Design a protein around this ligand. Structure first.
Ligand SMILES: Oc1ccc2ccc3c4ccccc4cc4ccc1c2c43
Lengths: 216, 214
């Protein structure tokens, strides 16, 4: 799948800077150019520049000349890209890639915003008492009012992965809302319990919510 | 900059059909043209470099061709795992540049959505909000309309929608629609309804509950 390892998501104020790492393991770090690419949602891909670690050779796209700064450290097989005087046109996913074969990082999301970090509220979605007894039942989690992205959502700590749709977050004002559904056999719920797990690393929050049938 | 225009900008094709997408450069790029595949929420992956060379492990159904300004990527027999967005890149002159991408979506049998409505949790009502959620899952094709009704009357503000990309298992699409009110608003009405209208029927699929029960 992905062969290079990038640093994690970042929330940074407008005007400030971030430094993203790209780790490239292997004995030949100085033999390969590292490319840096920008992707804003809805837009396509865009080339930022490249660096050849250990050579003093670097090529910038003109458009990012004063925005990106590339360095590399050869003893740790790690390339860096600093992005400076950030504005909201800089909010995007950034990738690094070797200039050879299929060697891409997982990407690094950057959010340029001075909005406040806010933990989510996690709400269960259990079927109404207008209870439809087809042979499958759908349950859900609403994950509301958080900032920044991402949260990760799982079901029974990862053990339940079939029947799951986790929907992209939507940004309303300066807060995200996201929902996840899971569909399971009717015979098996509620007797075999279903719990949603939500992690919001930016607020150092984790919430677990058992989906319980509605009472009265 | 060299400009790359990809055509078509999106495509539908069935399992086993041949597929051809094109990349046109604004000047001669002397065969320095790569192709990448990007799936929803994943990183890009390198398929073809220098017009027509396969990266190791790339399946044989892929090939590339072209010269001067006109390049193509060809899939000889389409597989379900070939869904995604395809990008060309030229490396003849700095700055290197990508095309705008071609989205490739897989055909399949029509399928109505499975629609579920959920009242607000009692937990959320304690904070003074009330979100009503409607899931429209595993439908094809992607085009769908969701309409919310409070006591028989259409409602449009406070509604937030989110679509999935094409499912990697069954090639369907899903959607989530959340109607957010205040608890005060929510407690004043009785009947809440989401109506989905999809290509498969001229009757909307209607799902609703009455606040008066648990
Ligand atoms: O000649 C080449 C052989 C393999 C390549 C693999 C990846 C990339 C690449 C990836 C991201 C951004 C720009 C890139 C440019 C090249 C250019 C040549 C090349 C390869 C490239």
């Amino acid at each position: 799948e992905v062969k290079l390892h990038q640093s994690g998501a970042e929330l940074v104020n407008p005007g400030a800077s971030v430094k993203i790492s790209c780790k490239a393991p292997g004995y030949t770090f100085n033999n390969y150019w590292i490319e840096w690419v920008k992707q804003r949602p809805g837009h396509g891909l865009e080339w930022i520049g490249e660096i050849l670690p250990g050579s003093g050779r670097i090529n910038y796209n003109e458009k990012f000349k004063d925005k990106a700064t590339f360095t590399a450290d050869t003893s740790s097989n790690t390339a860096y890209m600093q992005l400076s005087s950030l504005t909201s046109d800089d909010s995007a996913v950034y990738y690094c890639a070797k200039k050879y074969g299929d060697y891409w990082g997982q990407g690094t999301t950057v959010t340029v915003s001075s909005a406040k970090t806010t933990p989510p509220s996690v709400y269960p979605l259990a079927p109404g008492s207008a209870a439809q007894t087809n042979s499958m039942v759908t349950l859900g989690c609403l994950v509301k009012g958080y900032f920044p992205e991402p949260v990760t959502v799982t079901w029974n700590s990862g053990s339940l992965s079939s029947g799951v749709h986790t929907f992209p977050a939507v940004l309303q004002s300066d807060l995200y809302t996201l929902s996840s559904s899971v569909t399971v056999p009717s015979s098996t719920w509620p007797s075999e319990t279903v719990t949603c797990n939500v992690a919001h690393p930016a607020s150092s929050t984790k919430v677990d919510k058992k989906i319980v049938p509605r009472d009265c | 900059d060299i400009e790359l225009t990809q055509s078509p900008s999106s495509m539908y094709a069935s399992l086993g059909e041949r597929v051809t997408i094109t990349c046109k450069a604004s000047q001669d790029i002397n065969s320095y043209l790569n192709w990448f595949q990007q799936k929803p929420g994943k990183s890009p992956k390198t398929l073809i470099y220098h017009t027509n060379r396969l990266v190791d492990g790339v399946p044989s159904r892929f090939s590339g061709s072209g010269s001067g300004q006109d390049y193509s990527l060809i899939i000889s027999s389409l597989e379900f795992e070939d869904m995604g967005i395809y990008y060309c890149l030229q490396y003849d002159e700095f700055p290197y540049t990508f095309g705008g991408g071609t989205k490739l979506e897989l055909k399949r049998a029509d399928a109505a959505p499975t629609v579920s409505i959920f009242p607000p949790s009692s937990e959320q009502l304690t904070s003074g909000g009330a979100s009503v959620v409607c899931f429209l899952n595993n439908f094809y094709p992607k085009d769908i309309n969701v309409k919310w009704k409070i006591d028989g009357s259409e409602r449009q503000n406070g509604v937030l929608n989110s679509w999935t990309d094409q499912d990697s298992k069954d090639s369907t699409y899903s959607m989530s629609s959340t109607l957010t009110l205040t608890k005060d608003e929510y407690e004043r009405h009785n009947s809440y309804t989401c109506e989905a209208t999809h290509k498969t029927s001229t009757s909307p699929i209607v799902k609703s509950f009455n606040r008066n029960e648990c």
